[PDB]
């Protein structure tokens, strides 16, 4: 309930500085996409900088692929 909502907020508060150091321009979007997955992987990404990089690099490619689809329309 509201406890899991606070858990999801604080996980974003821990992930955002690390992602902002990695990808500062689109840090807010990558944190929002990564926050959708289960919390078990989120706690692992904070302990391993390599696992965080893999999820962030996957998230940046997702936004890049969606921007091309949105540009193909108008």
């Amino acid at each position: 309930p509201l406890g899991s909502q606070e858990q999801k907020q604080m996980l974003g508060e821990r992930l955002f500085p690390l992602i902002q150091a990695m990808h500062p321009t689109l840090a807010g979007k990558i944190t929002g996409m990564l926050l959708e997955i289960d919390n078990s992987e989120l706690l692992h990404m904070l302990e391993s900088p390599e696992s965080l990089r893999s999820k962030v690099d996957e998230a940046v490619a997702v936004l890049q692929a969606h921007q091309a689809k949105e540009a193909a329309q108008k």
């Binding site: 899991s4 909502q5 999801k8 907020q9 974003g12 508060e13 955002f16 807010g28 979007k29 944190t31 929002g32 996409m33 990564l34 926050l35 959708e36 997955i37 996957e58 998230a59 997702v62 936004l63 692929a65 969606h66």
Partner: peptide
Amino acid sequence: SNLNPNAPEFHPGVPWKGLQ
């Protein structure tokens, strides 16, 4: 493995949208 590009943006200090 599925990531949503339309996921709500996370801004520190304000409650995240799509919060269930």
